[PDB]
Design an enzyme around this catalytic site. Structure first.
Site, mmCIF file in Angstrom:
data_model
loop_
_atom_site.group_PDB
_atom_site.id
_atom_site.type_symbol
_atom_site.label_atom_id
_atom_site.label_comp_id
_atom_site.label_asym_id
_atom_site.label_seq_id
_atom_site.Cartn_x
_atom_site.Cartn_y
_atom_site.Cartn_z
ATOM 1 C CE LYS A 1 -4.327 -1.891 1.953
ATOM 2 N NZ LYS A 1 -5.604 -1.404 2.781
ATOM 3 C CD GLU B 1 -3.625 12.109 6.860
ATOM 4 O OE1 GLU B 1 -4.239 12.697 6.035
ATOM 5 O OE2 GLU B 1 -2.735 11.251 7.721
ATOM 6 N NE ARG C 1 -9.949 -10.073 -7.640
ATOM 7 C CZ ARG C 1 -9.586 -9.165 -7.157
ATOM 8 N NH1 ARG C 1 -8.386 -8.672 -6.382
ATOM 9 N NH2 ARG C 1 -11.149 -8.644 -6.941
#
Lengths: 678, 60
Positions: free
Chosen positions: A118, A202, A295
């Site tokens: 990530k 954040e 995918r």
């Protein structure tokens, strides 16, 4: 380019049949794969050839990528489609396929490896310039730094902590110009939750709704983004119901979602089909990147109902084979237009009343909803199982997918309702009742549902119809008749018949009594929960004389006196009676009455147990003192002229030894007392 | 306006099946009615629920 005539599939289930079908239209060969047994499964009955791979555990089956590659080489396979799961996300397997020379279907190995971590992925998107909401900025070096970037990097304040979900440092402090409470909140969070003193700030979003656009790319530098999607409804990170046309989404936004998505895919480089996922807050009005998947999703046929290319139906898997062909595209982003709305729902072989635990059992009767067009709506069902099949515990519980395309949302939602109702399965409890409850009472027909939408309405849901005393009457009657000639040819003297059934509904036994008056098998009565009435009953053809685990499936008719009439297809077994009709489906458990029928001994067993004859000389005792002995093991072995003659006592309860090995004992001595465990 | 989810039919015969059919497209429930016996009739095998009403004569 390279010709393809043989197609290989990795996984099993609905995707196997889907990949196999279109293949027929392209006129290409097919190959199937199956685990130990698993050879009666449908997909193998759909392919041209199938190969067994090995033991049921997923480590043993569908994970030996090297063995799969060697087998494919021996078969001279042209292409492999991994599908989703197993080796769907593994760059080593794709690289080995490329080295072997087979056209892998999907992204290159580099993209999969990069998106595996990530941190490096978010690094790549941050370099690309896509609006991304990060997880962290630095650390809590200074408390004044918190005020420095509080109004700087991210005005919304997400205090939280370095780790842990307690989040008491948050305090839902959405008010800026906060400087005396944020530091106090963080310092009180540090207490008893010290962890690491580093703190990350954040942006905090009050609301969250998930978005995910689709994309497609050839290998000749040309692509086009498909329509958006919504996955707001999910329980415990499991997809439940989704909508390809995000209701309440402005056209202009749709357009832009594409420009952002194409930038990210081009930056990493991409070939084939994929999906970018966003996270969105209505109050802010902006979307921030969360994750992408390299995918094909499971939700591909859903978005299809809301997109047409050059006025023709779109097939997503088709293009992926054509992408592997090396041919370039034929359409710009323009040729694709949306038409109407559609909704989807997944059915899981789990029990809603329980902890959504999967159950494995044979599939007795499977109703199939009308998969044809009628009115202003299209409804389809795709199932990876059929009649006579059995669910495997190793696999995930997944039966079928139902999709209701329509010209308007209303039509689509209304369509499903009826379809969801119509589809019926007998043998294993399902969540189909839950999904219908999720659709009727919740006023989500408006179209605004958050990510946590399921959490608040849990009280309202998890509700099923109440078993009326009448339902017991048809259910009880079926078990008799669907087992024997009860009430058939019966006859007594100057009296009348009687026969009773015991149901273990919930944790309370239920008794139902049935009897007749006159010379009529037809006229029948009932008395359950102190409620009495009359009805007549007319059966159908007698079937399933072998009365196996599936037992007997027959239709029934019941004319109750009030005036009604009913039709009930009852597959009854000793364990339970299942009745399906206009009421719905209900399975009633029969009161269990089993308990070592025979060996029911409460005798004290005080003395004179496993007594040995005169010679004695006990030795080699292999039983521990004070251990339960229900099965007749050799408690003591005594030898009389080479006569082991083991006693082999079967008295239940722990056995207490009063002798030791090698001790000569007299005739009929109390070697041990076999007493009930107290 | 008033929502409709249940439809009731009075008579029997071709009209019963006709009224019942379109009903499926509108996605609405159905109810059937039948005289003494007259339970093997097709229309009742087409509805969702059927009720017996009484003796054969049209008065009854």
């Amino acid at each position: 380019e390279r010709k393809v005539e043989k197609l290989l599939v990795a996984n099993r289930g609905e995707i196997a049949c889907r990949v196999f079908r279109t293949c027929r239209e392209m006129h290409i060969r097919t190959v199937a794969l199956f685990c130990e047994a698993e050879r009666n499964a449908k997909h193998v009955a759909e392919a041209d050839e199938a190969v067994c791979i090995g033991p049921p555990p997923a480590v043993n089956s569908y994970l030996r990528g090297e063995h799969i590659i060697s087998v494919a080489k021996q078969l001279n396979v042209d292409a492999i489609h991994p599908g989703y799961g197993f080796l769907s996300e593994n760059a080593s397997f794709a690289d080995a396929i490329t080295r072997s020379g087979i056209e892998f279907i999907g992204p290159p190995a580099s993209a999969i490896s990069l998106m595996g971590s990530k941190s490096e992925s978010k690094r790549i998107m941050e370099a690309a310039g896509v609006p991304v909401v990060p997880g962290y900025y630095g650390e809590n070096q200074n408390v004044s730094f918190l005020a420095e970037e509080a109004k700087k990097v991210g005005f919304p304040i997400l205090i939280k902590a370095v780790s842990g979900g307690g989040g008491k440092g948050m305090k839902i402090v959405e008010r800026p110009e906060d400087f005396t409470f944020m530091l106090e909140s963080a310092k009180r969070e540090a207490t008893n939750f010290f962890k690491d003193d580093r703190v990350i700030l954040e942006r905090y979003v009050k609301r969250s709704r998930h978005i995910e656009c689709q994309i497609f790319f050839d290998k000749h530098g040309r692509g086009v983004f498909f329509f958006e999607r919504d996955c707001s409804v999910q329980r415990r990170y499991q997809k439940v119901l989704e909508e390809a046309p995000a209701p309440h989404l402005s056209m202009e936004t749709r357009q832009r979602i594409g420009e952002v998505a194409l930038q990210a895919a081009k930056a990493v480089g991409y070939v084939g089909a994929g999906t970018v996922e966003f996270i969105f807050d209505t109050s802010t009005g902006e979307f921030y990147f969360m994750e992408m998947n390299t995918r094909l999703q499971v939700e591909h046929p859903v978005t299809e109902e809301v997109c047409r290319i050059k006025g023709a139906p779109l097939d997503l898997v088709k293009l992926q084979i054509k992408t592997a062909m090396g041919k370039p595209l034929t359409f710009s982003q323009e040729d694709v237009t949306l038409v109407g709305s559609c909704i989807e729902a997944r059915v899981y072989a789990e029990s809603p009343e329980r902890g959504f635990l999967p159950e494995s059992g044979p599939l007795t009767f499977i109703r199939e909803p009308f998969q044809g067009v009628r009115g202003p709506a299209r409804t389809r069902l795709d199932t990876g199982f059929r009649e006579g099949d059995n669910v495997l515990i190793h696999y995930d519980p997944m039966l079928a997918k139902v999709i209701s395309w329509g010209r308007s949302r209303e039509e689509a939602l209304r369509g499903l309702r009826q379809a969801l109702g119509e589809y019926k399965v007998a043998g294993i409890n399902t969540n189909i009742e839950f999904l219908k409850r999720c659709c009727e009472t919740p006023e989500f027909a408006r179209g605004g549902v958050t990510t946590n939408f399921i959490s608040e309405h849990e009280s309202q849901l998890l509700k099923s119809p109440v078993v009326t005393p009448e339902v017991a009457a048809m259910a009880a009657t079926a078990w008799l008749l669907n087992r024997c000639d009860n009430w058939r040819g019966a006859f007594r003297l100057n009296s009348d018949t009687n026969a009773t059934v015991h149901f273990y509904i919930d944790d309370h036994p239920v008794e139902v009594r049935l009897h007749t008056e006159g010379a009529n098998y037809h006229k029948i009565f009932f008395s359950v929960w102190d409620h009495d009435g009359s009805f007549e009953v007319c059966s159908g053809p007698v079937t399933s004389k072998h009365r196996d685990q599936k037992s007997i499936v027959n239709d029934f008719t019941f004319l109750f006196e009030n005036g009604m009439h009913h039709t009930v297809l009852a597959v009854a077994t000793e364990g339970d009676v299942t009745v399906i009709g206009s009421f719905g489906l209900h399975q009633l458990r029969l009161l269990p009455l089993t308990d070592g029928f025979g060996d029911s001994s409460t005798a004290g067993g005080t003395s004179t147990k496993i007594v040995s004859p005169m010679p004695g000389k006990v030795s080699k005792l292999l039983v521990k003192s004070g251990d339960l002995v229900e099965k007749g093991q050799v408690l003591v072995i005594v030898e009389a002229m080479k006569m082991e003659h083991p006693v082999r006592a079967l008295q239940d309860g722990r056995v207490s030894f009063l002798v030791k090995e090698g001790e000569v004992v007299g005739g009929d001595h109390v070697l041990a007392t076999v007493a009930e465990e107290e």
